[PDB]
Structure formats: structure tokens, C-alpha cells
Paper text:
In addition, we solved the X-ray crystal structure of the DARPin [name] also in complex with the wild-type p632/p732 hetero-tetramer. The structures of DARPin [name] with the mutant p632/p732 and the wild-type p632/p732 hetero-tetramers were indistinguishable, displaying the same intermolecular contacts. This, again demonstrates that the mutations that were necessary for the in vitro generation and selection of the [name] (by holding the heterotretramer in a stable configuration) were not important for the binding of the [name]. During the expression time of the [name] peak a strong pulldown signal using the DARPin A2 was detected that was not present at times in the absence of [name] expression, while a control DARPin did not show binding at any time point. These results also confirm that the mutations introduced in the ODs of [name] and [name] to stabilize the p632/p732 hetero-tetramer for the DARPin selection are not necessary for detecting the hetero-tetramer. A detailed structural analysis further revealed that both [name] bound to the hinge region between the first and the second helix of both [name] and [name] ODs. Titration with the [name] yielded dissociation constants of KD = 10 nM for DARPin [name] and KD = 17 nM for DARPin A2 and a 2:1 (DARPin : hetero-tetramer) stoichiometry, while a control DARPin did not bind at all. C Addition of DARPin [name] reduces the complexity with only the p632/p732 hetero-tetramer being strongly populated. Some additional peaks of low signal intensity probably represent DARPin—hetero-complexes of differing stoichiometry but these oligomers represent less than ~20% of the p632/p732 heterodimer population in case of the DARPin [name] and less than 10% in case of the DARPin A2.
All members of the p53 family form tetramers in their active state through a dedicated oligomerization domain that structurally assembles as a dimer of dimers. In contrast, [name] and [name] form hetero-oligomers of all possible stoichiometries, with the hetero-tetramer built from a [name] dimer and a [name] dimer being thermodynamically more stable than the two homo-tetramers. Here we report the generation and characterization of Designed Ankyrin Repeat Proteins ([name]) that bind with high affinity and selectivity to the p632/p732 hetero-tetramer. [name] are small kDa proteins consisting of multiple stacked helical hairpin units in which certain positions can be randomized to select tight binders for a folded target domain.
Numbering used by the authors:
A (entry chain B), E (entry chain B): 352 to 397
B (entry chain C), F (entry chain C): 1 to 159
C (entry chain A), D (entry chain A): 357 to 413
Write the structure that this text describes.
């Protein structure tokens, strides 16, 4: 549906991108209220 | 913060009951915080590990410990729908009306997730139905938004 | 006891915002139950059934 | 007269470094002669001769 | 040789990535001494 | 910094001689700086626009203007191999021994690029062959590194 393929040179590069792919794909599963608490937290630290 | 502290956070998260008991026996910090400020008790509540929650509640671990977002274990048991864990947190002295940074009570978060039995338990322990978040919204207002009609009507009956 | 609080100096709005989306995604994973992770990871293992290849002709 | 000097607050080493690689690449382009740009851009126009497509079967 | 293909959803997203593809591909053509002057400049501003 | 200033930077960069003359007639800042601190004169030197360089050198524009990296128009004419531009900058009073932030002289940068005629011109105007960059390297040391044997031997003969 909205799946995207890419290609990367370098094992270290692939590993970083797999770490972030994971964390970015999982973000959709984080309840919005906890996201809102979190962004509140970041703004307070400014 | 400490090695045993991180192992205990991870054992609590992953439901390793024997590991938890053994780390604690060896002096692991029960107030260890992960990167969002969660304690093993928070992580046991998130991940639904009732036995681990009961174990941690026999220690000095604060049942009302706040992570960096102001979430208590009761907020997170509530949002993830862990009814048994909600019940024992409340028995262990969980503040039913604890506020996170955007003014969510466990009731807001049970409302958000559509966890009916948990809304019922929170009301039973004196959840405040008239509490407003940052954005001026009640548990009711959020049940409405998220199309939780069961919970909408339970909340209106109580206000 | 808390994790060490380090600070990252960032030249510019755009790099900052980008690093913020990244940090946010890495941190907020902590709030996910293992049932959710394990569901994700089985979804991912099943993507491997059909592997990526560069096509030709 | 100089360009306006703005500052971008960035939480963390990693986002900072990333935004720095980006800014650097955008700024240092200024040092390239147009002969070099035009060579680049003709190289790029010629990549279009053979277009990208998702292959099937 | 070391060319890599990727796929992006959203015209605004493609435009940003084409801007950076340009600036990152052209970086190889910047004489190293001027890069070194530049990185010196950034360190001085710390 | 100004609208005409940016147009003049871009006209100088892109070799738009008539545009340059017209922007200047209309009062465009000849000391306008781009995002790396380059003046129209810098950009005319980079891009090899001899006529535009000659035009700008009939104004108050500083022939020894430094960008944010300490590069003078003579550094950039030197590195990009614009012999005629090097010659007129030197005639217009370009400092032959100007230092950028990492201690490169125009001689270092002509050495780096393997521009023989330009090394010759820089020596002829009194380039200092014994000048060391941040990293302790002469024009000579850099000709060696970059396999510029012609220029290596010209530089050794002069030291």
C-alpha cells in the first residue's frame, strides 16, 4: 500500500537505518496521549 | 544509572519473573529509570506482568512514581487495558486522579483506549469525571472523540 | 537512579527538527508492550518470506 | 551586507551531526564554478535517458 | 557502480530529497582545502 | 542582506555582464555577501567571469575581501585555475600571501589544484614558498602529496 523500498551501501549504514526504520514504524502504535505528554516534556526542557 | 538497574528494567519489561526476583535479591534499584523516566513498576504495568507488579509492590518502589511525562504505573496499566494490574495498583495506593504533563488522568487514558471495565474500576475508586486536560477535555469529551459510546454513557451517568 | 542527561548542540532549525523526530521515535518505543513489539516483529519476519531483489529485463 | 545569522537548537549529538553534514553540503556548493554545476546537471539529465521503474515478473 | 535507488511518498518529500541529493553529490567536487577552511570556520563559531 | 545584493551575487556567479552593470547602476551592494561570506568579486573569480571581475575592480569592492573561511578572490581564482583573473587581481592589489582559516595561501591552493602557470604568476608577485598551513605543510609539501611533480620542482627552485 504505502511501503517503500531503498538500497544502502555499507553494513554500519544499513544497521542505523534498520534501527530507525524500527523506531519510526513503531511510532504509529504509540497512543497519541503519551506522544502529547512526551512533546509537552520536550517543550518544558526549553 | 546502574547495571542491575538496567537489567531489572529489562527483566520487568520482558516478564522474566525469576530474573526480577534474583536481580532484586542481589540489590537491583527498584527506582531505576529508563530513558523516558519509567521504573520497573511502570514497565511491568505497560507489558501486563501482573506477578512482577505484585512482587515490586512488596518493595519501597513508589506506586505513584512519575516518569518524565508525569505518567504513573496506573496511567499505563489503564491505557494498555491491564485490568488486574489496575486493580492491584489501586489496592497498593495508586492515586486514581494522578495528572500527567498534558493533564490526563488514568480515566482520560482508559476513555481514549475504549477499556470499559477499567473505566468502571476507576470510577469505583473515585475517578474525577470532571477533570480537564491541557486542551480542555474530560474523559467524556475523549470517549466522544474516539467513538466509545459505551464509555460515553457510563461517564455521563457519573458526572 | 536516572539515565545520564547529555546535550547535543545542533546548528540550525532543520537538523534540530530532524534529530528530534529521530530521538522521539527511539524513546517512545519504551511505552510499547512486548505483545505489540512481537506483533510488529512477526509482521517483519513475514516480509522476509518475499525478499527484495533488483529486477532485470 | 551579510545573510541573517539564525541559530538552530538541536537536542543531541546525533541530530546535530546529521544537520551539520546537510548544512555543510548546501553551503559549500557556493564554491563550485557553473562549468562544474553544468557538467553535473548534464550528467543528471543523461540519467533520465534511462528512467527508474519498479520491475514485475 | 555505487549508485543507489530509492522511493519516496509525497511531492514535498521528493523535492527536499532532490535538493539534498544535489548538494551531497556535489560535495565530492568541492576542493578539500575549502572544506577544511569551512570546518575550521564551524569549530571557531563553537 | 538586500534584494539587489542577492541579484548581483547571482548575476556575478552566472556571468550576466549586462545584468551586473545594470544592478550596479541601480545601486546594488558590491560588498553583498552570500551564505559562505563571498562577495560578487569572489563569485566572479570562482566562475571565471573575467569581464565581471574587471568591472567590479573599478568599484570600492575590496580585492582582499575575506569570506567566512578567510578565502580572498585570489585564493579562489587560484584553486579553480583562472589565470587571467589571478593576473588582474594581482594588478588590482590582491595580497599574494593572504591566509585563509587553515593557513592556505593562494600558492597552497594553486599547488593543490596542479595549476602550473598560476604557481609561476604567484611566485612572480612574491608568493612565500616557506608558508605553512595549520597542518605544517608548504606549497611544496602539497604539490608532493597531490603528485604535481612539475610544480614540486618549480617550488623547490624558489625556496
Amino acid at each position: 500500500e504505502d511501503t517503500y523500498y531503498l538500497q544502502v551501501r555499507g553494513r554500519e549504514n544499513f544497521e542505523i537505518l534498520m534501527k530507525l526504520k524500527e523506531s519510526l514504524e513503531l511510532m504509529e502504535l504509540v497512543p497519541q496521549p503519551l506522544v502529547d505528554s512526551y512533546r509537552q516534556q520536550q517543550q518544558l526542557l526549553q | 544509572g546502574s547495571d542491575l538497574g538496567k537489567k531489572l528494567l529489562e527483566a520487568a519489561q520482558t516478564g522474566q519473573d525469576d530474573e526480577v526476583r534474583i536481580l532484586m535479591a542481589n540489590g537491583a534499584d527498584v527506582n531505576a529509570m529508563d530513558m523516558v523516566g519509567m521504573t520497573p513498576l511502570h514497565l511491568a504495568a505497560v507489558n501486563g506482568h501482573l506477578e512482577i507488579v505484585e512482587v515490586l509492590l512488596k518493595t519501597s518502589a513508589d506506586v505513584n512514581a512519575q516518569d518524565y511525562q508525569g505518567e504513573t504505573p496506573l496511567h499505563l496499566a489503564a491505557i494498555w487495558g491491564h485490568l488486574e494490574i489496575v486493580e492491584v495498583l489501586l489496592k497498593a495506593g495508586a492515586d486514581v486522579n494522578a495528572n500527567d504533563l498534558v493533564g490526563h488522568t488514568p480515566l482520560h487514558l482508559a476513555a481514549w483506549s475504549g477499556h470499559l471495565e477499567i473505566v468502571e474500576v476507576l470510577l469505583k475508586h473515585g475517578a474525577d469525571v470532571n477533570a480537564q486536560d491541557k486542551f480542555g477535555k474530560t474523559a467524556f469529551d475523549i470517549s466522544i472523540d474516539n467513538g466509545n459510546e459505551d464509555i460515553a454513557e457510563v461517564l455521563q451517568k457519573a458526572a | 537512579s536516572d539515565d545520564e542527561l547529555l546535550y547535543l548542540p545542533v546548528r540550525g532549525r532543520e537538523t534540530y527538527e530532524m534529530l528530534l523526530k529521530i530521538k522521539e521515535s527511539l524513546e517512545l518505543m519504551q511505552y510499547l508492550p512486548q505483545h505489540t513489539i512481537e506483533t510488529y516483529r512477526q509482521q517483519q519476519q513475514q516480509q522476509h518470506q518475499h525478499l527484495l531483489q533488483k529486477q532485470t529485463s
